[PDB]
Design a protein around this ligand. Structure first.
Ligand SMILES: *[C@@H]1O[C@H](CO[C@@H]2O[C@@H](C)[C@@H](O)[C@@H](O)[C@@H]2O)[C@@H](O[C@@H]2O[C@H](CO)[C@@H](O)[C@H](O)[C@H]2NC(C)=O)[C@H](O)[C@H]1NC(C)=O
Lengths: 440, 446, 439
């Protein structure tokens, strides 16, 4: 779409706008099931099937060993704390009630996909993706009560047993909870049909179908129960209750004075960088922008990694001194040079004797940054160098706008400025400055 | 057991108690071995063609493990309170065994003891009595079933399929070591199968309590174990499986949940906050308390907690008084004073702490009935009894449906005891006494 | 090599020197290709195994639907910059979507498996054909469309395995994997990829002798499925800085040891990590876990570094020097800990903690008193601090103990600014002159 950026010279920050939201807000719990079999002149083929049957016994013995265990799994320190799989573990706990697997075992008699009402009222979508009991009771039990010369029986059993062996492996090195959800746990044809039957909007169906590889990354596979010849595990799928609302990304870098004595210098950095998305009259703020996933101009975030802020937080980009929101800063003296590759350019904080440049593949250096905080758009720029570090800029097409302004750090007297404030605000600094002045 | 929770309204914190400890204090290093075959025909059919392809994989796997072993095993070393932790190598005990196996005649000592059996106890030259395992004998299979066929031909397809099955474990063990620089964790079923691990545990020189504990929680043992690629020499592939030893068992553990405690005045610039910074796992250990500040390093199975003491701080047992009397003179309880006047929730073991500030909508809902509690400004708590979800702003939290009793300890929020005009806001890691000292200075200035 | 250590008693820090640098400064992008085919009981196995190939290709098309995506940001690790590691390899992915660009590779990989192709953007890439499924399916599986030659089923199973496995790795990694697996690039393919690479023989010898490190620092980016070609990019590191001196700085908290633990003040150097000489400056790596050590060589990615003046080294010799403002923090961290260094251990013992250094067979050989001290690994096997047991490195090297007055003793506890998350020697002196002027 129309991706645009604004660099604010006054605050050493940039906003990339034009994105669309797809926020994980809820969970959908489904029960995936695998129908198991309960079973007990020696040539080579009977030996091979006993070897392949030993694996089936080993995997079943191991999954019972996992089922022994009740399932367990800048401003980010302000976030809350919650259990990601608490919604799926509660469903798993229900499946441990007597007759509850028997309800699923019974409802999955005439079909593979079914909606089952549990004792707690959760309407779950149950799946039978593999029937090993049918294969063992039809093709392998009569041939063992000890001679077969159809080698295709060995390969067919190897192929049919393979998915079970691998699902068991994934659960073994992951304490019974896996993420992302592999194609062994749930193939694409199973996932796409699971989406079509999901109690979601047609917009959410189209969104999840065109972005299945994100659904996998945001989903959990929880090993649940082995009981009554049934292997059941829970797949916890994302619900995107917020879709196509505006998102924007805020990039910040340190803003420092460039005086000759580096000990008479003070710094200032906006701490509110991350993803911002309009959401229900407020703004969902994602302080660790690494937890969000971007597909073109769509951004996938999980609300568990967010803060719900007033919409007035956006005024901090236009007027960081506005009275409506107390914009958050830090005053640690971070007089080292760095760069931040934005959506359509690069913020460069250049301090000291550092060589900071932006170059082109064939043309050469096209901008040399002086001390302070500056910005260059990706137009004609291929890389950015800061000291010995080379950064590649994004070659995405979009318009950058440079908002000239006086660096706000110049408005402060270094002799009273409270350096080393890990997390403060415009008002806390002003409060601390007025106190230190009254002592004079 | 009986897991219980206490919410302390005065400090906006909760303690989940009733747990039993299983803290890693030692290591057991075992040597896993695979006896290799030393191998060096034009006229072929299709079955020998498949065996030639599968034999190229065996050669490539051996060639790669030799390339990986070229590098002495390597680790990535350092130099809420996690920056306070120490720095040590987790696999240092297993690397010492690898160093011994590179001594001349040391691999041959293992080769001899695993000649007539698959499991054996070997005393190394450094005095370590290791439990050695021969989990795969490709030398016997290749020299008996594949060497005579090597101008050459066979039409027995069952040898091709059996060879693919026997060679697979080597190929998968090799893959895991290649994408993990020779050190893997957790230990996979290829590195050590479930039946081999259970028998390895049964022969281990430990008490029956630890045997029953490790046996009933093998999938935890895997995650807390390391597989260290060691040596290929004299037709032997050897790697070390480093297993945890739980020297602290069945001592009391409890989890501390904290959330910001702020004043709820109308003007958001007159509001001050306070948060207990000591959250994490606490376990009684040897007259002290092992404190695990990164509560992600501990793994909980029902009412048992598995932690690694390498990720702990050793505190006096008086640190527990901070939950009863945060102003006690015996321990200086640690708080922070950053003005964190945003709403958030903390999902505990048996409930939810809700810090609601400003204009944020904080509610607690039921499975199907909907909102059953609306939180007002301040710090409150709801039990998981009858509650399924918690909403704070646009964030929906699911509570844990574990069964246990919650106890609400009513008390005056201690943030109300401070004058906002002298309160030292923005203290990243301070204590009750450090704050009190800073207030007397700003008051003595009047 | 000759690893040496110095412990500075005055600042509770130790420097391990003698290492050699190998710093990632550039990237080599190569295009790996897989030529695809467009399409009783024994055919049942062939139909099932053929469905896997169709589904795997169907999935890669579903994965390729998404231009590769990254998780970018917006002790001092928060001071680092922000950049995309795979941006150079993503540029190749963008080129391969241009018309006629795949056919250029398809043409160059007609008579051989390895070829150098000049792309439309001017990048001379080394292209590889590691699997030809088009040949197998159009020659052995198209004519059967029954056959009861079971060796055809197994041969297809063996040839299809790598494709299915490459698809799996991309599915649980959003199309970008690291390290690069043997499926993405086998060891013989990587060794030959290095040998045909336009680099010096020294870097070839370096990369060849440390391939499992090259894998960890390399990325595999899924690119395109088009015109019967599956193409992905393997992004390999180039080490532009080699054999310059590196050293590691270990720090631990330095506190006073008075009787009342509330009259005690602490001080910790925050500049711990890896330091390597680089282009007249010093590349500083604050999270030393991002570096990988092989014997005495240090492999780091400059994307995780800060470029500091070379005078930063004076902080180890004279922390009060005027040339560099040495960085400290003053949080009251009066808990005991140990730091295992290259040749010894730093021990910060405070309060009532039992801190000892023991031998395997001899027992306790040193008991640490309150404060910050050091023991060399010579004759020492373990260190105990409270309930935590640390193993020392048994590496051979000499440690040098630099005796000095702990600098925390130079401060008046009544004016010392405790709770400074990241300050410096001069910032602390500045705050004390102010707090004294108020008296
Ligand atoms: C500004 O303050 C510094 C630091 O003084 C410190 O705080 C004092 C209250 C006391 O605790 C000192 O021990 C601390 O050093 C002054 O530098 C000190 O100067 C005195 C001179 O007698 C010397 O003994 C100290 O060692 C110095 N401090 C250090 C860390 O070396 C400085 O003189 C003050 N004034 C100015 C203008 O900088």
């Amino acid at each position: 779409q129309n991706i645009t950026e604004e660099f604010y010279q006054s605050t050493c920050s940039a906003v990339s706008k034009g994105y669309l939201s797809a926020l994980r807000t809820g969970w959908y719990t489904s029960v995936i099931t695998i129908e198991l079999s309960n079973i007990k002149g020696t040539d080579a083929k009977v030996k091979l099937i006993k070897q392949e049957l030993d694996k089936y016994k080993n995997a079943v013995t191991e999954l019972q060993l996992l089922m022994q265990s009740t399932p367990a799994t800048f401003l980010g320190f302000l976030l809350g704390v919650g259990s990601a799989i608490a919604s799926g573990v509660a469903v798993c706990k229900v499946l441990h009630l007597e007759g509850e697997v028997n309800k699923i075992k019974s409802a999955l008699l005439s079909t593979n996909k079914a909606v089952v009402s549990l004792s707690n009222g959760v309407s779950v979508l149950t799946f039978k993706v593999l029937d090993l009991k049918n294969y063992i009771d039809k093709q392998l039990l009569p041939i063992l009560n000890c001679s077969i010369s159809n080698i295709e029986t060995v390969i067919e059993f190897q192929q049919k047993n393979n998915r079970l062996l691998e699902i068991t492996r994934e659960f073994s090195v992951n304490a019974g909870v896996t993420t992302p959800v592999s194609t062994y746990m749930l193939t694409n044809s199973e996932l796409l049909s699971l989406i079509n039957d999901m109690p979601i909007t047609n917009d959410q169906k189209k969104l999840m179908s065109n972005n299945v590889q994100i659904v996998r990354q945001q989903s959990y596979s929880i090993m649940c129960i082995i009981k009554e010849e049934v292997l059941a595990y829970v797949v916890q799928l994302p619900l995107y209750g917020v879709i196509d609302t505006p998102c924007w990304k805020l990039h910040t870098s340190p803003l420092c004075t460039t005086n000759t004595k580096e000990g008479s210098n003070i710094c200032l950095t906006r701490t509110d960088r991350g993803w911002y998305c309009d959401n229900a009259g407020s703004v969902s703020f994602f302080p660790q922008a690494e937890t969000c996933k971007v597909q073109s101009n769509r951004v996938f975030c999980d609300t568990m990694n967010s803060l719900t802020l007033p919409s007035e937080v956006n005024l901090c980009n236009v007027d960081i001194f506005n009275p409506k929101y107390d914009c958050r800063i830090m005053t640690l003296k971070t007089d080292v040079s760095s760069s931040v590759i934005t959506s359509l350019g690069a913020i460069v904080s250049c301090y000291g004797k550092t060589k900071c440049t932006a170059s082109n593949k064939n043309r050469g250096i096209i901008k040399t940054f002086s001390n302070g905080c500056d910005y260059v758009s990706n137009k004609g720029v291929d890389t950015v160098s800061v000291g010995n570090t080379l950064y590649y800029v994004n070659k995405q097409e979009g318009k950058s706008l440079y908002v000239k302004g006086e660096p706000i750090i110049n408005f402060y007297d270094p002799l009273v400025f409270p350096s080393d404030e890990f997390d403060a605000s415009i008002s806390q600094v002003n409060e601390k400055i007025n106190q230190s002045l009254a002592f004079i």
